[PDB]
Amino acid sequence: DKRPNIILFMVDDMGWQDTSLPFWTQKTDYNKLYETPNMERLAKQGMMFTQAYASSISSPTRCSLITGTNAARHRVTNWTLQKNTKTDRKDKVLDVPDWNYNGVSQVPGTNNTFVGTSFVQLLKDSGYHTIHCGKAHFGAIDTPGEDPHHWGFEVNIAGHAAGGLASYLGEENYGHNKDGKPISLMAVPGLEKYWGTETFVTEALTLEAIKALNKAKKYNQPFYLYMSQYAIHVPLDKDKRFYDKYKKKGMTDHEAAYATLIEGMDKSLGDLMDWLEKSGEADNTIIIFMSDNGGLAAESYWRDGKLHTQNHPLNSGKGSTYEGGIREPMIVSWPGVVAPGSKCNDYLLIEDFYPTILEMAGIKKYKTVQPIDGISFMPLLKQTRNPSKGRSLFWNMPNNWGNDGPGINFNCAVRKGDWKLIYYYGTGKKELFNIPDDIGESNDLSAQHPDIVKRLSKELGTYLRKVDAQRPTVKATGKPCPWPDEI
Ligand SMILES: O=S(=O)(O)O[C@@H]1[C@H](O)[C@@H](O)[C@H](O)O[C@@H]1CO
Ligand SMILES: [Ca+2]
């Protein structure tokens, strides 16, 4: 049995610049402030992806990962928590559609749910031992998708409906009182052994993952580990292991705490890489590093710089269709298959992870209930072909997040070659950016290139109708907002 182990190491709310590893053309101030030596170690042994995309919010990205569908299709287009409860902020002008706020599942029977065959279920069915560690956030509370075991994971460390965490601190029981009562729906479950200890949640998850990997080695099976950090999500607890030195770099209390979440996430990566090396698994293990959306840039309560700049040189952040919200740090290591110290700037979307992971696992034939929108990036990894040649990428956010900002709320977009069109459902406004010429999306070229705006509007409208995508409605009329090619 020559099949590789696979680790998908997913960070929460980590931006393109939330690392010491430069994904841009030079080092930023952020690359010089943050410390991720194990990300640099991973890049030295693998391939960096400098144009990797997600959706701008946890739920659409993670539902796209586990089902291999574009967010416009699965309609989980804002964050989930409570059953049958839209998290959208009310708007004066527009109503959000009746979107899939219960999330995803593998089974029929529940309203407002997208049903899809899990790639993790296919891995398990093929004989992989499957481990979930950390943030799940696939289904609302009291829906079958809330439980990682529903997805085909045999082991669950700390995964549930919630896409946040009540506390990073062992001394606060990760959000339980002294009686063990949860302080909120975000309380982190299954870490009772660490309650009352000076163990940061990132460290506890790593220690539990390593226990599960020691078990995995005894089982005589290839393993799949989804190492899904709760870091670096708010609230910004400080990790006292790392905090003092960021204050000496002149960072604010919040920004120094943020840096400590990054460094602890990087220590977790390093601890798993160390385990692979010591256990003799490193030569037959794939590591995929990814983040689920851009760095938080729209909440002055948590972030201290000029708002909407926390992913500079990218514009905006979490919740935005601008690069700051959707462009993610991504690395793939696969010893003897992927060239070490390589870079790939060809674009891809999170749903592409689904067929790629099954291909890595040698699963050449599989049945799914849903169409798979993902396209394998195996040819990018092997440097053989660009599977995204002439490919359009699509985003749909007919929703209202908790914050306003540049490229946030009630919009959809298409990326094709150098060009990105963003359409605002409420106003009919169209922004056109040349991403390589203008990576900060500061120069709207829509008036200068009406033929490009027309071509991309048709592509965007056609795609959204093809996948039965949703749009907001105008409160005044009850009529849906026009598709971009109806303008
Ligand atoms: O899941 S996330 O999408 O990352 O985060 C959700 C949302 O945007 C955040 O504004 C909130 O604070 O936490 C939610 C947890 O689910
Ligand atoms: Ca997130």
Side-chain angles (χ1 to χ4, degrees), residues 1 3-89 91 93-177 179-192 194-197 199-210 212-247 249-282 284-363 366 368-384 386-388 390-453 455-478 480-487:
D1 179 348
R3 294 169 295 164
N5 312 306
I6 301 167
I7 301 178
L8 174 56
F9 189 104
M10 179 72 72
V11 189
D12 202 18
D13 294 350
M14 180 190 176
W16 201 60
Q17 293 288 326
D18 289 347
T19 171
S20 57
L21 177 60
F23 279 81
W24 189 42
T25 57
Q26 67 206 53
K27 290 188 193 191
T28 62
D29 64 339
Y30 286 139
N31 297 147
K32 299 168 192 187
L33 288 174
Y34 300 136
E35 298 188 24
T36 60
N38 294 297
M39 284 179 68
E40 294 174 28
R41 169 193 186 185
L42 191 65
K44 195 175 193 326
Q45 61 176 66
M47 182 172 287
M48 293 171 59
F49 287 77
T50 50
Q51 205 165 208
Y53 294 105
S55 292
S56 68
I57 297 290
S58 173
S59 296
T61 298
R62 292 169 192 267
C63 293
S64 287
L65 168 62
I66 205 73
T67 67
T69 63
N70 183 268
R73 184 191 302 280
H74 67 52
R75 303 173 168 192
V76 190
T77 43
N78 205 349
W79 62 278
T80 64
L81 182 58
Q82 295 230 66
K83 190 161 184 180
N84 289 332
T85 308
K86 292 189 291 289
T87 57
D88 307 81
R89 176 170 54 121
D91 187 73
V93 178
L94 300 183
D95 280 325
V96 303
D98 194 44
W99 62 275
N100 284 338
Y101 38 71
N102 288 331
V104 290
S105 86
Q106 299 204 87
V107 293
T110 307
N111 55 285
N112 298 93
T113 307
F114 187 84
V115 178
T117 306
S118 173
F119 76 81
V120 177
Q121 193 73 56
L122 292 171
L123 288 177
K124 185 186 179 302
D125 295 349
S126 78
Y128 273 66
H129 174 54
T130 54
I131 306 159
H132 173 79
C133 184
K135 175 168 162 174
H137 199 209
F138 300 118
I141 297 166
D142 287 342
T143 73
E146 72 184 330
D147 185 351
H149 298 111
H150 178 74
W151 295 98
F153 286 107
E154 289 165 320
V155 172
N156 176 24
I157 304 148
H160 61 130
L165 79 164
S167 177
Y168 286 85
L169 304 181
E171 302 95 328
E172 294 188 333
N173 306 335
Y174 312 115
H176 307 79
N177 70 10
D179 302 353
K181 189 179 69 49
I183 73 169
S184 83
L185 296 177
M186 299 307 92
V188 184
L191 296 180
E192 290 98 328
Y194 300 95
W195 287 9
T197 77
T199 307
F200 211 70
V201 74
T202 307
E203 184 65 32
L205 290 177
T206 304
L207 292 169
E208 289 302 304
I210 289 173
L213 291 178
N214 286 324
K215 273 278 194 201
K217 192 163 178 60
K218 295 177 174 178
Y219 286 177
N220 308 125
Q221 304 173 250
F223 66 79
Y224 173 67
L225 168 65
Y226 186 42
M227 191 75 185
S228 183
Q229 302 293 347
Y230 281 107
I232 62 179
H233 203 285
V234 295
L236 303 183
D237 280 310
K238 57 179 180 171
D239 189 337
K240 71 153 148 59
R241 294 178 298 174
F242 310 122
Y243 181 73
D244 289 344
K245 70 183 178 183
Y246 296 107
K247 292 302 303 174
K249 295 190 195 196
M251 299 175 79
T252 67
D253 287 2
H254 280 164
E255 294 304 326
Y258 191 79
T260 74
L261 301 187
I262 288 164
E263 188 169 0
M265 168 280 293
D266 183 82
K267 182 185 182 288
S268 179
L269 174 62
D271 291 342
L272 294 177
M273 294 176 74
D274 289 348
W275 182 89
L276 293 173
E277 290 179 4
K278 296 304 198 306
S279 69
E281 294 293 331
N284 194 39
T285 302
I286 298 166
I287 303 170
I288 307 165
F289 185 99
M290 187 53 171
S291 177
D292 72 331
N293 60 64
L296 178 62
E299 286 187 21
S300 55
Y301 189 91
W302 288 120
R303 303 304 307 268
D304 287 331
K306 181 160 168 188
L307 279 185
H308 315 299
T309 69
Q310 284 63 30
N311 302 283
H312 64 242
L314 309 184
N315 200 329
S316 205
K318 184 174 187 183
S320 184
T321 307
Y322 287 179
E323 295 294 285
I326 58 167
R327 199 171 182 155
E328 305 304 323
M330 174 176 174
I331 315 169
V332 178
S333 171
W334 189 356
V337 175
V338 169
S342 56
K343 296 202 186 178
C344 178
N345 197 59
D346 289 309
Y347 54 55
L348 61 83
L349 254 175
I350 184 71
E351 51 259 37
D352 300 345
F353 280 48
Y354 182 119
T356 306
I357 289 166
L358 294 172
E359 189 175 353
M360 289 166 160
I363 308 171
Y366 49 95
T368 66
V369 298
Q370 77 278 25
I372 300 304
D373 294 320
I375 295 180
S376 175
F377 56 84
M378 187 69 80
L380 297 183
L381 288 174
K382 294 193 156 182
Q383 303 189 240
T384 54
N386 172 16
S388 287
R391 180 187 183 195
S392 295
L393 306 180
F394 298 101
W395 294 266
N396 194 30
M397 202 221 321
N399 288 86
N400 207 22
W401 194 45
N403 305 293
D404 292 313
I408 313 183
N409 303 315
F410 295 122
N411 71 72
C412 55
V414 54
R415 175 73 185 277
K416 190 186 204 289
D418 293 348
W419 298 102
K420 187 178 178 195
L421 175 70
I422 307 172
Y423 173 65
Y424 297 87
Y425 280 116
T427 62
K429 184 175 198 209
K430 295 183 188 176
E431 294 181 329
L432 182 69
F433 301 108
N434 187 301
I435 297 298
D437 205 28
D438 176 31
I439 206 177
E441 289 168 301
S442 66
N443 188 31
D444 178 4
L445 287 173
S446 59
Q448 278 97 295
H449 295 107
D451 290 350
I452 297 177
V453 174
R455 166 175 76 68
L456 289 183
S457 291
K458 289 202 303 168
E459 199 142 349
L460 182 51
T462 295
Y463 182 80
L464 290 169
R465 291 191 291 279
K466 179 166 180 165
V467 306
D468 204 6
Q470 302 182 298
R471 43 177 172 169
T473 56
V474 185
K475 288 190 157 178
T477 60
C481 296
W483 296 119
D485 53 348
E486 291 175 337
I487 293 259

